[PDB]
Design a protein around this ligand. Structure first.
Ligand SMILES: *[C@@H]1O[C@H](CO[C@@H]2O[C@@H](C)[C@@H](O)[C@@H](O)[C@@H]2O)[C@@H](O)[C@H](O)[C@H]1NC(C)=O
Ligand SMILES: *[C@H]1O[C@H](CO)[C@@H](O)[C@H](O)[C@@H]1O
Ligand SMILES: *[C@H]1O[C@H](CO)[C@@H](O)[C@H](O)[C@@H]1O
Ligand SMILES: [Ca+2]
Ligand SMILES: [Ca+2]
Ligand SMILES: [Ca+2]
Ligand SMILES: [Ca+2]
Ligand SMILES: [Ca+2]
Ligand SMILES: [Ca+2]
Length: 311
């Protein structure tokens, strides 16, 4: 019947269409036939003038509030003229404006990812929203430049987008236990509007390290008259892992000779090796002690140090 177009968020007084002209009403016709909007509801957003006969915007119109996520916003108004009483249907289309920015449910997102996460692992992300319609809604996502993750966007169901993290390289807590990424959602307007979500990846610890002694092989010498209680050497094994995965226990090799165990005694905690028995040149000119640094993680890791004792 009567179709006009008006831009969303237009200021009150904005022209929409000439009702009087498109109906054949000129001058006194507007009064004699009583030009009029249908009900009080029709005049909420519009006003029909008795002077110009033009349909204008009464109150600022928000397209998102009226039609929401509808494809086309068609606002029906009722124009009444008397003698003869004839009613005219007028459909005013509310053109969408790109005045809404992509929104996330939460400004920040935390992810607890294990250090043993294999490449190809997919981690879902919160989807953004843009109440605008057409190209003005969410178009694509971007992920801040990193060295471990990749961004993949899957469009499911009705064409809405669901972003997810794709692990490219294996994480390592020993290098950095945290990664901060910025998920940015962008719409397809000109100019484009965006919104962000701060993703902080927490790398959980995994026992992926074995204890390592300061030296692979140590050679020391003690006099023939070394008294009982004398410290030979204090072992030093390091483990970069967190918590119990980093704590270690010292011990001899499982097949260490009984002679060595009767002569020497190590403190499993401090790693201090003491000579406790007698030694001469005749018994043996040398002893080869096998040290071991057992981890406390599951599974347990271990390092090894061979100590050569000359006398
Ligand atoms: C124990 O060793 C710490 C680390 O030493 C380094 O790492 C080991 C695995 C070897 O490769 C060694 O050659 C390196 O220098 C030292 O930082 C630390 O001071 C040592 N002592 C104690 C009491 O921790
Ligand atoms: C999100 O991205 C848009 C362009 O895509 C920027 O204009 C905005 O400032 C924000 O960085
Ligand atoms: C997304 O990220 C931007 C920049 O990282 C922040 O400024 C914003 O508040 C949101 O957290
Ligand atoms: Ca709006
Ligand atoms: Ca809009
Ligand atoms: Ca938008
Ligand atoms: Ca690692
Ligand atoms: Ca680790
Ligand atoms: Ca370890």
């Amino acid at each position: 019947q009567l179709r006009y177009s008006v831009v969303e968020e237009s200021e009150p007084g904005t022209l929409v269409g000439n009702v009087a002209q498109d109906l054949g009403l000129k001058g006194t016709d507007l009064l004699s036939r009583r030009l009029r909007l249908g009900s009080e509801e029709n005049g909420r957003y519009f006003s029909l003038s008795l002077v110009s006969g033009a349909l204008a915007v009464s109150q600022k119109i928000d397209r998102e509030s009226l039609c929401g996520a509808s494809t086309s916003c068609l606002l029906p108004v009722q124009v009444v003229t008397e003698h003869p009483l004839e009613l005219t249907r007028v459909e005013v289309e509310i053109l969408d404006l790109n005045d809404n920015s992509p929104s996330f449910a939460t400004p920040d997102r935390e992810m607890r990812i294990s250090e043993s996460a294999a490449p190809g692992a997919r981690f879902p992300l919160d989807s953004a929203q843009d109440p605008d319609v057409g190209t003005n809604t969410v178009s694509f996502y971007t992920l801040s430049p990193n060295s471990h993750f990749s961004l993949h966007v899957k469009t499911l169901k009705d064409g809405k987008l669901f972003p997810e993290l794709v692990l490219e390289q294996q994480l390592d807590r020993e290098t950095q236990a945290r990664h901060q990424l910025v998920l940015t959602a962008v719409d397809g307007g000109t100019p484009a509007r965006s919104g962000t979500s701060l993703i902080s990846v927490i790398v959980l610890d995994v026992n992926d390290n074995a204890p390592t002694f300061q030296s692979s092989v140590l050679r020391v010498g003690l006099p023939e008259n070394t008294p009982p209680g004398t410290l030979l050497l204090r072992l030093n094994a390091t483990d970069p892992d967190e918590g119990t995965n980093g704590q270690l226990d010292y011990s001899f090799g499982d097949h260490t000779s009984e002679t060595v165990k009767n002569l020497f005694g190590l403190d499993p905690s401090s790693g201090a090796i003491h000579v406790l028995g007698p030694v001469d040149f005749e018994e043996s000119n040398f002893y080869e002690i096998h040290a071991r640094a057992r981890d406390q993680g599951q599974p347990a890791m271990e390092g090894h140090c061979v100590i050569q004792v000359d006398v």
